[PDB]
Scaffold this motif. Structure first.
Motif, PDB file in Angstrom:
ATOM      1  N   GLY A 102      79.284  45.136 113.698  1.00 40.86           N
ATOM      2  CA  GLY A 102      78.791  45.059 115.055  1.00 40.86           C
ATOM      3  C   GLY A 102      77.287  45.258 115.140  1.00 40.86           C
ATOM      4  N   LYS A 103      76.798  45.306 116.377  1.00 41.22           N
ATOM      5  CA  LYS A 103      75.384  45.510 116.664  1.00 41.22           C
ATOM      6  C   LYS A 103      75.175  46.898 117.249  1.00 41.22           C
ATOM      7  CE  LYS A 103      75.392  40.830 116.444  1.00 41.22           C
ATOM      8  NZ  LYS A 103      76.538  39.900 116.629  1.00 41.22           N
ATOM      9  N   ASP A 157      84.563  43.077 121.992  1.00 45.19           N
ATOM     10  CA  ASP A 157      84.337  41.637 121.964  1.00 45.19           C
ATOM     11  C   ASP A 157      85.491  40.998 121.209  1.00 45.19           C
ATOM     12  OD1 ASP A 157      83.326  38.933 121.183  1.00 45.19           O
ATOM     13  OD2 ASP A 157      81.474  39.646 122.102  1.00 45.19           O
ATOM     14  N   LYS A 202      85.761  37.768 120.284  1.00 47.94           N
ATOM     15  CA  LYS A 202      85.299  36.839 119.257  1.00 47.94           C
ATOM     16  C   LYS A 202      84.841  37.575 118.004  1.00 47.94           C
ATOM     17  CE  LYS A 202      82.172  32.931 118.545  1.00 47.94           C
ATOM     18  NZ  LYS A 202      83.098  31.874 118.061  1.00 47.94           N
ATOM     19  N   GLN A 203      84.109  38.678 118.171  1.00 41.52           N
ATOM     20  CA  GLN A 203      83.753  39.508 117.028  1.00 41.52           C
ATOM     21  C   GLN A 203      84.937  40.309 116.511  1.00 41.52           C
ATOM     22  OE1 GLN A 203      79.750  41.439 117.106  1.00 41.52           O
ATOM     23  NE2 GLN A 203      79.804  40.931 119.292  1.00 41.52           N
ATOM     24  N   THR A 235      83.209  42.357 108.810  1.00 38.81           N
ATOM     25  CA  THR A 235      82.882  42.259 110.229  1.00 38.81           C
ATOM     26  C   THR A 235      82.079  43.476 110.657  1.00 38.81           C
ATOM     27  OG1 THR A 235      84.854  40.944 110.723  1.00 38.81           O
ATOM     28  CG2 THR A 235      83.793  42.084 112.552  1.00 38.81           C
ATOM     29  N   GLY A 294      88.352  34.486 118.240  1.00 35.56           N
ATOM     30  CA  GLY A 294      88.048  35.385 117.146  1.00 35.56           C
ATOM     31  C   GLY A 294      88.884  35.174 115.907  1.00 35.56           C
TER      32      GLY A 294
END
Lengths: 153, 40
Positions: free
Chosen positions: A151-152, A54, A56-57, A149, B33
């Motif tokens: 994640g999932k 991702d 954005k992440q 940062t 991001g």
């Protein structure tokens, strides 16, 4: 010649010149997106192919889904396992600050290391990776603040 | 092309150096991001 089930967990340099750092855990390689830009990685004969990512992440996983799910408890100090280019890995303890966005609050570490350190893991006192270092801001005095940062899973 | 090489084990180190402050910052995350500071 290895025992069935053996992996080699640990922290790795992403080399090209060190462009970043990553975490090997449960057979998946975790780093930040801007480090590899979703490109494939070599692991000496073996090739790591991207699985999830991702922009954005600013996160990406190789060989499987994102495995890291531990989170900063908002209260206790953490340790950056800093792996700077040309230097040995080293632990830095700090109390995280806070990034406040319109969509919630994120922990942030006020530690300043070169760009090739992105993807270095941030740890809770259990040794669990609560996020990756390397995506943040430079404030008015020139110093760098990085988000924790995560994640999932 | 890129490759990875081992750098160490992921462990909490007892008696590690403590440093850095804990600033509270109002930031914005764009679709690329990238974080940026929010103007007062």
């Amino acid at each position: 010649e290895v025992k069935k089930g053996e992996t080699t967990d640990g922290v790795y340099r992403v080399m090209t010149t060190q462009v970043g750092v990553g975490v090997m855990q449960e057979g998946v390689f975790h780093t930040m997106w801007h480090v590899t830009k979703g490109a494939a990685l070599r692991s000496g004969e073996g090739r790591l192919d991207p699985y999830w990512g991702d922009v954005k992440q600013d996160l990406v996983s190789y060989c499987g889904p994102w495995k890291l799910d531990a989170a900063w408890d908002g209260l206790s100090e953490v340790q950056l396992l800093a792996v700077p280019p040309g230097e040995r890995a080293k632990n830095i303890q700090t109390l995280p600050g806070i990034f406040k966005t319109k969509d919630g609050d994120i922990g942030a570490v006020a530690l300043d290391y070169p760009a090739g350190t992105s993807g270095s893991p941030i740890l809770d006192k259990c040794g669990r990776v609560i996020g990756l270092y390397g995506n943040g801001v430079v404030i008015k005095n020139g110093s760098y603040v990085s988000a924790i940062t995560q994640g999932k899973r | 092309d890129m490759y990875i090489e081992r750098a160490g084990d992921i462990t909490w180190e007892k008696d590690a150096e403590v440093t850095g402050n804990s600033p509270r910052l109002d930031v914005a995350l764009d679709e690329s991001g990238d974080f940026s500071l929010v103007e007062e």
